[PDB]
TrEMBL record:
GO cellular component, one term: cytoplasm
Alphabetical keyword list: Isomerase, Rotamase
Top-level taxon of origin: Eukaryota
Protein name, entry field: peptidylprolyl isomerase
Single GO molecular function: peptidyl-prolyl cis-trans isomerase activity
Keyword Metal-binding carried by entry: no
Residues of the PpiC domain: 1-120
Species annotation: Trypanosoma brucei brucei (strain 927/4 GUTat10.1)
Keyword Coiled coil among UniProt keywords: no
Amino acid sequence: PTERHFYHVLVKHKDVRRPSSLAPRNKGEKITRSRADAINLAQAILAQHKERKTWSLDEFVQVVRDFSECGSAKRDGDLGMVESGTYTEGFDTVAFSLKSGEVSAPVETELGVHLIYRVE
């Protein structure tokens, strides 16, 4: 009945419960990433546009498929028409209640951490 169009960056580490990526060429393959590389990943993005309070769309889409690990070739870290009640608490609440051209808070799910970006 009501969905939104936004993106997100999935970042994980080898210190997780299931440190592995579900890619076509790297299916069932382990990732050589550390807990320090997980945070610095999502953090580096939010800071990629530092010195200026302005988050561009195309600017994020570039870091999305470059950072997100949620099937780069599958969804490329890009979300589609999603309705309220599809994601977990905190994600579907912010992602849907996000500001056009802004990034949501650092959501930490049992599976891993990831960020959201509202598309204009």
